[PDB]
Amino acid sequence: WXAXCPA
Amino acid sequence: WXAXCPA
Amino acid sequence: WXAXCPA
Amino acid sequence: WXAXCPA
Amino acid sequence: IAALVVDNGSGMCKAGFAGDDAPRAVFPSIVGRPRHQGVMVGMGQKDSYVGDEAQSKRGILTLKYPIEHGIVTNWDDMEKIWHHTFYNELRVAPEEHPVLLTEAPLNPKANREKMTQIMFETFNTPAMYVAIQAVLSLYASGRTTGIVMDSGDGVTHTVPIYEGYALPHAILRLDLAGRDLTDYLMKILTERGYSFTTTAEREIVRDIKEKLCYVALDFEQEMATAASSSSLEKSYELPDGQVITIGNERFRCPEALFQPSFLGMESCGIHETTFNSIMKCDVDIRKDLYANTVLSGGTTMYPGIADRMQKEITALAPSTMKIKIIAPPERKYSVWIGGSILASLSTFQQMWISKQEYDESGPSIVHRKCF
Amino acid sequence: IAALVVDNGSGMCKAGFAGDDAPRAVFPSIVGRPRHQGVMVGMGQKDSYVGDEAQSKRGILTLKYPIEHGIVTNWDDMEKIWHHTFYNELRVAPEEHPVLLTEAPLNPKANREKMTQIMFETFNTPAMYVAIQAVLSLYASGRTTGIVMDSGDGVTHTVPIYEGYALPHAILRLDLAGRDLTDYLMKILTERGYSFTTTAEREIVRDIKEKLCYVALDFEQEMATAASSSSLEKSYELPDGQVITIGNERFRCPEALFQPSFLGMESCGIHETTFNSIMKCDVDIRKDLYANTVLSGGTTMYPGIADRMQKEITALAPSTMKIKIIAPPERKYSVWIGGSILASLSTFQQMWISKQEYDESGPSIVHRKCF
Amino acid sequence: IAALVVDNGSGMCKAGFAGDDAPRAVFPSIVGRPRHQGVMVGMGQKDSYVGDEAQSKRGILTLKYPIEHGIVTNWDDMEKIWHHTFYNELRVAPEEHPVLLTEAPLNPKANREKMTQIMFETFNTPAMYVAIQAVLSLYASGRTTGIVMDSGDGVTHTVPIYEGYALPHAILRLDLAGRDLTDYLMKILTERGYSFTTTAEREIVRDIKEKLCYVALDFEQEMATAASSSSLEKSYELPDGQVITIGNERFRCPEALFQPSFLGMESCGIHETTFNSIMKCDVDIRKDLYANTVLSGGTTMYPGIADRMQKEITALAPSTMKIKIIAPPERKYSVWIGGSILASLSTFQQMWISKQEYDESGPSIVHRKCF
Amino acid sequence: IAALVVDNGSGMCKAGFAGDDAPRAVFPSIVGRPRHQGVMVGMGQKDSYVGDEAQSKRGILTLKYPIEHGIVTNWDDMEKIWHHTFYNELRVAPEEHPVLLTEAPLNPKANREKMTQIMFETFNTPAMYVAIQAVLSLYASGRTTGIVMDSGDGVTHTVPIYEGYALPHAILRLDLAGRDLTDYLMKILTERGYSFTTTAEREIVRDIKEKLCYVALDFEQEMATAASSSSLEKSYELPDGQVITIGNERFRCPEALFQPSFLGMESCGIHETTFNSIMKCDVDIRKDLYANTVLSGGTTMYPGIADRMQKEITALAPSTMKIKIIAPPERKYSVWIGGSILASLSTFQQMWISKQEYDESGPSIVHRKCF
Amino acid sequence: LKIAAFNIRTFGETKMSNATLASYIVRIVRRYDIVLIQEVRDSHLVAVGKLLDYLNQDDPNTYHYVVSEPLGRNSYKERYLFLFRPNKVSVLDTYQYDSFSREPAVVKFSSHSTKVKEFAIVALHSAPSDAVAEINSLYDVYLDVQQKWHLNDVMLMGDFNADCSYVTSSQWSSIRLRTSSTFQWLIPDSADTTATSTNCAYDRIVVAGSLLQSSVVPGSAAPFDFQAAYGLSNEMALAISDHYPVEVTLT
Amino acid sequence: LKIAAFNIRTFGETKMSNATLASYIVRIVRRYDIVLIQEVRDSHLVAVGKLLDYLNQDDPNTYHYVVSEPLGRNSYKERYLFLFRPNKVSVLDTYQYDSFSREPAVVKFSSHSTKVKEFAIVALHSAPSDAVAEINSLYDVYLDVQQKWHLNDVMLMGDFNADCSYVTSSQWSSIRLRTSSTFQWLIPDSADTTATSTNCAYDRIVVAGSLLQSSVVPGSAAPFDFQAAYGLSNEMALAISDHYPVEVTLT
Ligand SMILES: Nc1ncnc2c1ncn2[C@@H]1O[C@H](COP(=O)(O)OP(=O)(O)O)[C@@H](O)[C@H]1O
Ligand SMILES: [Mg+2]
Ligand SMILES: [Mg+2]
Ligand SMILES: [Mg+2]
Ligand SMILES: [Mg+2]
Ligand SMILES: [Mg+2]
Ligand SMILES: [Mg+2]
Ligand SMILES: [Mg+2]
């Protein structure tokens, strides 16, 4: 992703 | 209607 | 609540 | 260990 | 020969031919438009649903009632339902044979003018006639003398008829009816602990009202009994499988018919309106109205309404009076039966308004030859 | 002497003494329990945290709101909040002086019955009274006529009052509120590329809304501005040090109040609801109601909410109408301010509900001697 | 002429032609670069290995998944795997016929935008379209109503559909999936006494997951048998040559879906998410949604998953309701099969996004013309 | 009744009373069997030399480490190491007072299972407890929040703890440790010209590592100074009398911790595995863990290690983050020092596994009660 | 330019479990800029990556790998390896065989340092029970190289399983390489090319092309006795492999 | 049965770095059943492990070792290394005696081949400065072992560093060894017991006990000139040690 999850 | 009630 | 909404 | 590592 | 008769009342609508003893096309007058996009493209679907189609799939559609308080509001939507009943339901072209229309009294002038124009222009029907719904109820019961109690979905009205000669100075129109009763049941059911705010849930409330609600002879006494006993309680099954419990709300809602102040309406109760209507008439005929009091409309189906009706009138009326309440079965469809009998009558055939009269004089003829 | 006032509700709770100019005890109404096994011996930490304790350590606890949409759902966790505010925060014994409570209009009757039982059994307070959160806002603004909009965390309600005599039939309740806005902001932020899943980050989303979100005067033209510019993008600092940039979501989130179709809610918008509430009232009083429309609640703390509503009402309302929106500062604590003033009034000493009255008639007395 | 249905999910990729009943090209979505410089015999410096070639030469190559929870983190590698699946496996130039892509719902908006830009420039396909993976699952079953449970390798989501109308507010996405189960199995097997840390070793663990683990009907009941019975033990052979024994570790890994607290996720179970998905919908469509539940995704091939899910939902849902879990065979390829049916439909021809539309309106056309 | 706390780890083993500030019995955990039949003057360990005695005679004996990567392999050899610890070194009967043991996280169940059996059968200790090595490190530092970096001789692991709630899913374990560094230093020295093959020579290389090796922050450039200057070259004399010179090998050996690819291990570096553990934590607890980082273990007193890791982390971490590396003096006994503090605590007494509890539930209680 | 053909025995992950044995192999390979490794039973290329992990640890561009497909369906899936330094020599073109259980592989290097700029290398480890076939077979294969690549000099090694009763007097003349003067044999039968004490000249270094003959250093072609050179015993020598490296020096 | 004493000059890792010298020392030690080793500079027992490895490489129980903890009073500490064949003689008991830089040790031996059954071995490498002072105390040690261990025959022999100006005629009468005829001196003084050309008889042979004096074969006490016996030169012999082994035979 870009904040929360590792992605 | 046109004044009183909602119709 | 008890029926409608989740509460 | 018992598989992966040597121990 | 054959004549179409269609009950244009709010909520449930009735249709059929002249001479039949029961309408065939009965469906709510609701129209829904989807409020979600169609992700599935397998079928083309439709942007409008009328009649049982909207009732079958009322989960997604946004229900709207074209007829409110016995008034057509959205003429664009109002014409759509007439297409559905003529073609999809009855499979009969309006041009082949005439049609009969019904409406509530004291309607605004513009309503009659545009309703006739739609018949002449869109459906090019050779001849039609608009009649007071309460007047037709007398023909259904056979008697031509008495006071009629029509309590429809939107408007409850009274009109006295004494061997004919309908009195125009004693008609009282009350906007409290079953539609506002359901809205009142909407609020009181919140107190028990259930919410039905959305429009789709609003139709569930009407089903509960038509099944469990009943009229209590003595409102104050039943309040004490219900507050200390579960005998008055009855259960119900929602579409999703949940079970609700109804207590004093079972009979509080139908009791609002006699206490409009519970709904904030300054108007007096329907029992007092019926008493007031007779008072406006001359004393010579007042004895006749008490003997013949017929009941009509869907909101008369509550059990015990006839017994409560005669109890209140007895109080206001003097002693040694013949307080007779006539509540025949099928009175919910009594207006349709009365129209069917009237259309089958041969004398009334000369009273129709024809197309040639309309073109020569315009829509204003609805107020000279049509009553 | 001085009576406690507690505007118990979803989100922040305000408690304080009578006559105080501002509540001294504000804290989120959050009860959480750990979701991991204790590993440190001698830590001394308890197994339940409320108020500021849960907020500081929200990365471990599973936060749960006892109050949802205005109805208490978990009395086990709910009672802890009341025990904490009286003892750990207010540092006062509740059994010495009366306690005043507030609740939203149109609430289940079971909610009030259990609220009374807790006061008179768990805490044994000498006197208690529950008041509508809508009527308390008038006393804060020093007015007697007008409509209020106590848009809180759980429920948005409007109650028109005309020199007293609050109309029961015109009370409108809408489930849309600040808490549901956060859930929408949770979903719409996923499109940009930020994901928040657990309850711990739900509080983070709330802080973002309180610092950046605002209401645009116009909606259609506002999206065009963000399409060809970046001036509307503001940077924010996450607790972990990461930097997040908010695009057009700054104004889209508060827009769900005026267009409930964003959340799929079929009910009308917040501006349409007030118009509906006014029309239910009589015509003779509509002139006064239009002028006096005071706001309340933290959900109306967005900048520009005053001008946007005035445009919406003015277009809906007939012209040449003095449409004034009263949104004074400190209105975030409007409900508590009125309660403090009203409790200090000498007339309130007559309609207190003492423990003797509760004993003789049970919890049902709260529906008769109290509105 | 035809349509290229491509499902670039995580773990595996399916490609084929429209109208076929089964994909013709299935291979792991793994791209590897040469760790050490060198050349192949009889060939040039390939510089990249995609799919089964990568696993064959995993010793001298790195292993990296371009997809993590349905998000394209790197685009240089995604360009390679698309290049491999068009020329080296399908053996057809994409410039002749349009293609169709699939994506997870609630994905970042930047993910879809780059998909359009790459394909309309690198491959220059005449037309392109993007569809939700869950929506395409319903087409394979041939139904029009019912919720869709798409538990893929990286993302698990539910998309309730009623009569072809989606409910965007009812979409719930869970990051727990098959990949997280594989990582969880490493820690569980560590307790037994086997250590797996190598990326190439991770594939061997996944092979154990697909053949031995099963979901039981109860935790405590069956785990009691495991602690006192060797019948549940099943021997497995690693490619290295050794033989291991799996006992009670067989059932804990596939059942983490129902209790996500084992991995530390605060999100509720997969059965809870499906139950919460329906509860967000309206009351009238709950009867239909409960009856039609479609299971999809690779992580749904565990034996006994249908019975466990039905048991969990039955307890939560009210009684006297026909709960049915539809788990047909060939459900692993349900997503691709639906794409072939949708592409072959003539009605879908008016939904392709052409080059003319893309050029004038820019890459952002996929947000309005497409879902 | 005291509380015996013994580290029982790889390499050096610590044993001492509870409440003491420093261990008393410190000696390598090396046991050896006499390769040669002959015995010497008044010789008492004919079965096997145990402890530092085998170190003084490693030329005749053959050295075997009972602990490899933190798991017991030779249970018969372990029974000697404890018997030597309790009797000839600590000089007390273990049956008089209970003993506390430590174990690395993510250990096979068989290691803990047989640990309970030996203590309650061979030594008949009144009670026993097992504590994670990482957890006890925080107790010595006196803090309750932060991560633990225990880099021992056989295993290196990170166990983040937040306010006494350790996170099971964030525990990471790396097999590379101090023992592997010694092997790497032996291999590079062979190319230099000095070949070491015997177990005695392996020990000598370890002594060289503990005295000369150090960590350079500018490793990518230090080898230029090493290749262009002899200042970095230091000479350490060997026991045989040959003085060897260590040049660029002085700092290359400690670099294997940050670059595991030098040893062929594909796992991430020691600086990277700390960041990965934090990345698996919650967002709101991310800020606190950065401030509190505790370094422990015997492979940590390398000069300049704190500076190198602090510089490495601040590159990966977002800016404006206070990264503090807390490295208390005398960190070689942090694991044991923390054990003494926890043992002396009165609250910890209730967590001991009494002998009576072992009898009823067997050895299976070692996981029900302990971590 | 030191070129050798080292016939490792059972090259796989099994020999990678030991670390000391792999250390010696690292020492051997560094001696030769171009070295041929045969009989590598690795199938997933796990073992070959371990070499380049050690060989290229000093610098990534220190060696390059040239490996063949698992053409050896017989028992183990062995593959040939062409370990060469990239900055001494560069690979230009190569192809597989185009009669053998193990198909031969041919590569071409651009040796700028030596006088021979272009040359071809043929690697072939053969079946011990079928020695007669390939040796005459590759002679026809030699002729094809001179026209499809137009290279005059072509370099031959491999494990031909020669001598030690594998080939007799009757079939010695059957070898076209012996009859033809161009394919001179550098390795005499007297030299021992196996780690065992028994004399066995299994491998045969063959140099073809007139310009190549002047390029080879006279007397340089000799088996490598890594056992004595590194001070090792017989068991550790057999632990690595049963064969001795056979080098050649190019000037 | 054969007994001999060999003093190794600075026995430490510096000596077995050479391999030729390591080959030599195995030869002499195999020639006798009981060998006495002194001047063991080894501290970590590295040397003894390698030394007996060549002795037990084939049969694990050809020789058995007894080693003393370093008893050197000064910085230089030596060990009493013993090597004996278990089949011929077995160790019964050991004793470390309580005047000397390194205190002596005594052990019991069961020699079934010889007429005597139990005899006590006393070994001591004397301090060159205090050779006269320490040898007198050995008489008390001789008095020690005859009742506490109750051995009639005790064998005392080692490097006492006598003669060559270390012990003159006046100091010869000072010691009690020559005074009492119960213990008799064997190794001739004229004979040279050192690897050097100088005739220095540093090793002294002392025999006590009536039964053991009958067991010793007359004329069997003579230095072992390994320089001449093995045909080695002087500098090769000096590398092994600066002394010559002394051997006695008991029948
Ligand atoms: N069985 C029933 N019991 C009670 N009320 C009913 C029943 N059936 C219908 N109603 C009420 O009657 C209303 C309309 O009925 P009806 O009079 O037939 O329609 P219209 O108003 O068109 O004449 C509905 O709003 C409904 O609430
Ligand atoms: Mg009607
Ligand atoms: Mg509020
Ligand atoms: Mg998928
Ligand atoms: Mg340790
Ligand atoms: Mg071989
Ligand atoms: Mg030969
Ligand atoms: Mg002399």
Question: Mind spelling out the 3-state secondary structure of chain F?
Answer: CCCEEECCCCCEEEEECCCCCCCCEEEECCEEEECCCCCCCCCCCCCCEECHHHHHCCCCEEEECCEECCEECCHHHHHHHHHHHHHHHCCCCCCCCCEEEEECCCCCHHHHHHHHHHHHHHHCCCEEEEEECCCHHHHHHCCCCEEEEECCCCCEEEEEECCCCCCCCCCEEECCCHHHHHHHHHHHHHHHCCCCCCHHHHHHHHHHHHHHCCCCCCCHHHHHHHHCCCCCCEEEECCCCCEEEECCHHHHCHHHHCCHHHCCCCCCCHHHHHHHHHHHCCHHHHHHHHHCEEEECHHHCCCCHHHHHHHHHHHHCCCCCCCCEECCCCHHHHHHHHHHHHHHCHHHHCCCEEHHHHHHHCHHHHHCCCC
Q: Which amino acid is at G357?
A: E
Query: How much is the CA Rg of chain H, to the nearest whole Å?
Result: 22
Neighbours of chain B (3+ CB pairs under 8 A): E, F
Residue I6 CA to residue I67 CA, distance in Å, equals 15
Q: What are the E-state strand segments in chain G?
A: 4-8, 12-17, 25-28, 31-32, 38-40, 49-50, 99-103, 127-132, 147-151, 156-158, 161-162, 165-166, 172-174, 234-237, 243-246, 293-296, 325-326, 353-354
Beta bridge partners of J246: J5, J223
| E245 backbone dihedrals φ, ψ, rounded to 5° | -120, 130
The stretches of chain E forming alpha helices (DSSP H) are 52-56, 75-83, 109-121, 133-141, 178-192, 199-211, 219-227, 249-255, 270-280, 283-291, 305-316, 334-344, 355-361
User: How would you classify the pairing of strands G293-296 and H67-68?
Assistant: unpaired
| CATH class of the G134-175+269-334 domain in this structure | alpha beta
| I60 backbone dihedrals φ, ψ, rounded to 5° | -60, -35
> Which residues of chain E does B2 touch, with a Cβ-Cβ cutoff of 8 Å?
108
Instruction: Provide long-range contacts, Cβ within 8 A and 24+ apart, for G346-354.
Output: G347/E41, G347/E42, G347/E44, G348/E41, G351/E41, G351/G129, G352/G98, G352/G127, G352/G128, G352/G129, G353/G116, G353/G127, G353/G128, G353/G129, G354/G126, G354/G127
Angle F75-84/F109-118 helices, nearest 10 degrees?
A: 50
Residue G26's closest CA among G37, G41, G11?
G11
Residue G17 CA to residue G40 CA, distance in Å, equals 32
The continuous run of DSSP H or E covering H6 comes out as strand H4-6
Q: Do H279 and A6 touch (CB under 8 A)?
A: yes
Residue E296 CA to residue G302 CA, distance in Å, equals 63
| E221 backbone dihedrals φ, ψ, rounded to 5° | -65, -40
Say if CB G338 and CB G100 are below 8 A apart. Answer: no
At E216, list the tokens. 């209590």
Closest ligand 1 atom, CA of E332?
Answer: 18
Q: Which amino acid is at E79?
A: E
Asked if the C-beta of E192 comes within 8 angstroms of chain F's C-beta atoms, the answer is yes
Active site includes J78?
yes
List the catalytic residue out of J78, J118, J134, J247.
Answer: J78
In our burial notation (b when 16+ CB lie closer than 10 A, e otherwise), range H249-287 reads bbbbbbbbbbebebbebebbbbbbbbbebbeebbbbbbe
- Domains, chain J, ordered by start: 2-249 (3.60.10.10)
Residue E209 CA to residue E203 CA, distance in Å, equals 10
Q: Do B6 and F283 touch (CB under 8 A)?
A: no
At I210, list the tokens. 């007139």
Residue G172's closest CA among G245, G279, G257, G97?
G279
Q: Residues with Cβ < 8 Å from F136, sequence gap 6 or more?
A: F7, F102, F334, F335, F338, F339, F342
HEC readout, chain I = CEEEEECCCCECHHHHHCCHHHHHHHHHHHCCCEEEECCECCCCCHHHHHHHHHHCCCCCCCCEEEECCCCCCCCCCCCCEEEECCCCEEEEEEECCCCCCCCCEEEEEEECCCCCCEEEEEECCCCHHHHHHHHHHHHHHHHHHHHHCCCCCEEECCECCCCCCCCCHHHHCCCHHHHCCCCEECCCCCCCCECCCCCCCCECCEEECHHHHHHECCCCCEECCHHHHCCCCHHHHHHHCCECCEEEEEC
Residue H39 CA to residue H48 CA, distance in Å, equals 11
Residue F49 CA to residue H340 CA, distance in Å, equals 31
Tokens 């013309």 correspond to G369
Say if CB E66 and CB E152 are below 8 A apart. Answer: no
Beta bridge partners of J7: J38
Strand order in the sheet with E61-64: E49-50, E31-34, E61-64
Tell me if residue J64 falls in helix, strand or coil.
Answer: strand
Say if CB G330 and CB G23 are below 8 A apart. Answer: no
Say if CB G126 and CB G324 are below 8 A apart. Answer: no
Strand order in the sheet with J105-111: J89-96, J105-111, J118-123, J154-159, J203-208, J183-185
F2-133+335-371: which CATH topology?
Nucleotidyltransferase; domain 5 (3.30.420)
At G306, list the tokens. 């249908």
> Which residues of chain F does E191 touch, with a Cβ-Cβ cutoff of 8 Å?
108-109
Cβ pairs bridging G and H (under 8 Å)? 21
Neighbours of chain F (3+ CB pairs under 8 A): A, B, C, E, G, H
Residue F333's closest CA among F155, F84, F158, F152?
F152
**Count of C-beta atoms within a 10 Å radius of residue E207:** 12
CA separation (Å) from J136 to E97, G39, J71, J171? 157, 85, 20, 11
Residue E162 CA to residue E139 CA, distance in Å, equals 13
DSSP notation for E219-247:
HHHHHHHHHT-STT-EEEE-TTS-EEEE-
User: How would you classify the pairing of strands G127-132 and G353-354?
Assistant: antiparallel
Query: How much is the CA Rg of chain B, to the nearest whole Å?
Result: 4
Mutation choice for H interface testing from I16, I20, I24 by most H CBs within 10 A = I20
Q: Which amino acid is at I130?
A: D
In our burial notation (b when 16+ CB lie closer than 10 A, e otherwise), range H214-229 reads ebbeeeeebbeebeee
Residue G148 CA to residue G289 CA, distance in Å, equals 10
At H133, list the tokens. 């090595």
Residue H95's closest CA among H124, H121, H118, H122?
H124
Q: Do G193 and H110 touch (CB under 8 A)?
A: yes
Q: How many residues does chain C have?
A: 7
Say if CB G100 and CB G129 are below 8 A apart. Answer: yes
Active site includes I150?
no
Tokens 């009967």 correspond to H93
> Which residues of chain E does F110 touch, with a Cβ-Cβ cutoff of 8 Å?
193
Tokens 């004595």 correspond to I228
Tell me if residue H193 falls in helix, strand or coil.
Answer: coil
The stretches of chain H forming alpha helices (DSSP H) are 52-56, 75-84, 109-118, 133-141, 178-192, 199-212, 219-228, 249-252, 270-279, 286-291, 305-316, 334-344, 355-361, 365-368
Residue E104 CA to residue E133 CA, distance in Å, equals 6
Residue H125 CA to residue H289 CA, distance in Å, equals 38
Report how far ligand 3's centroid is from the alpha carbon of G305 (Å). Answer: 45
Say if CB H37 and CB H30 are below 8 A apart. Answer: no
Closest ligand 1 atom, CA of E182?
Answer: 27
- Residue ranges matching CATH 3.30.420.40 in chain E: 2-133+335-371, 134-175+269-334
Which of J45, J48, J96 is opposite residue H41, by nearest beta carbon? J96
**What's the half-sphere exposure (Cβ side, CA atoms, 13 Å) at F292?**
19
At I93, list the tokens. 């073109």
Say if CB H322 and CB H291 are below 8 A apart. Answer: yes
Residue E186 CA to residue E180 CA, distance in Å, equals 9
Residue E157 CA to residue E297 CA, distance in Å, equals 10
Q: Which amino acid is at F341?
A: I
- Residue ranges matching CATH 3.90.640.10 in chain E: 176-268
Say if CB J24 and CB J227 are below 8 A apart. Answer: no
* No. of helices (H) and no. of strands (E), chain C: 0, 0
- Which of E133, E150, E301 is the pocket-test mutation for ligand 1 (most atoms within 8 Å of CB)? E301
> Which residues of chain H does G191 touch, with a Cβ-Cβ cutoff of 8 Å?
106, 108-109
Residue G81 CA to residue G45 CA, distance in Å, equals 17
Residue H37 CA to residue H14 CA, distance in Å, equals 32
E176-268: which CATH topology?
Actin; Chain A, domain 4 (3.90.640)
Q: Which amino acid is at I88?
A: K
Burial of E135 (0-12, 13-18, 19+ CB in 10 A): buried
Residue E94 CA to residue E217 CA, distance in Å, equals 47
Residue F52 CA to residue F67 CA, distance in Å, equals 17
CA separation (Å) from G163 to E327, F160, G144? 44, 42, 6
| H99 backbone dihedrals φ, ψ, rounded to 5° | -125, 140
Q: Residues with Cβ < 8 Å from F71, sequence gap 6 or more?
A: C1, C7, F107, F108, F111
The continuous run of DSSP H or E covering H166 comes out as strand H165-166
Residue G77's closest CA among G51, G38, G40, G106?
G51
Report how far ligand 3's centroid is from the alpha carbon of I138 (Å). Answer: 94
Tokens 């052979």 correspond to G237
Experiment used for this model: cryo-EM
Residue G314 CA to residue G312 CA, distance in Å, equals 6
Residue I123's closest CA among I86, I71, I169?
I71
Beta bridge partners of I156: I122, I206
Residue G286's closest CA among E201, E85, H237?
E201
Say if G and D touch: at least 3 Cβ pairs within 8 Å: yes
Closest chain A C-alpha to F191 CA, distance in angstroms? 11
Say if CB I124 and CB I71 are below 8 A apart. Answer: no
Asked if the C-beta of E73 comes within 8 angstroms of chain F's C-beta atoms, the answer is no
Distance, C-alpha H147 to centroid of its chain: 17
The continuous run of DSSP H or E covering G311 comes out as helix G305-316
Report how far ligand 6's centroid is from the alpha carbon of I196 (Å). Answer: 10
Say if CB E146 and CB E118 are below 8 A apart. Answer: no
Residue F189's closest CA among F169, F165, F173, F213?
F213
* Residue in chain B lying closest to F277 (CA): B6
Q: Do C1 and E195 touch (CB under 8 A)?
A: yes
Residue G218 CA to residue G314 CA, distance in Å, equals 15
Asked if the C-beta of C4 comes within 8 angstroms of chain F's C-beta atoms, the answer is no
Neighbours of chain E (3+ CB pairs under 8 A): B, C, F, G
Beta bridge partners of H71: H68
In our burial notation (b when 16+ CB lie closer than 10 A, e otherwise), range E312-332 reads bbeeebeeeeebebbbeeebb
The torsion defined by the Cα of G18, G19, G22 and G27, in degrees rounded to 10, comes to -10
For atom 2 of ligand 1, the residue with the nearest CA is: E210
Residue G94 CA to residue E344 CA, distance in Å, equals 73
Q: Residues with Cβ < 8 Å from I232, sequence gap 6 or more?
A: I24, I226
Report how far ligand 5's centroid is from the alpha carbon of H153 (Å). Answer: 5
CA separation (Å) from E160 to E60, E322, G196? 45, 17, 94
Angle F178-192/F199-212 helices, nearest 10 degrees?
A: 90
Closest chain J C-alpha to H135 CA, distance in angstroms? 39
Q: Residues with Cβ < 8 Å from E213, sequence gap 6 or more?
A: E185, E250, E251, E253, E254, E302
Resolution of this entry, Å? 3.8
At G267, list the tokens. 């999100």
* H262: DSSP letter: G
Report how far ligand 6's centroid is from the alpha carbon of G279 (Å). Answer: 71
List the catalytic residue out of I39, I78, I134, I247.
Answer: I78
Beta bridge partners of I120: I108, I154
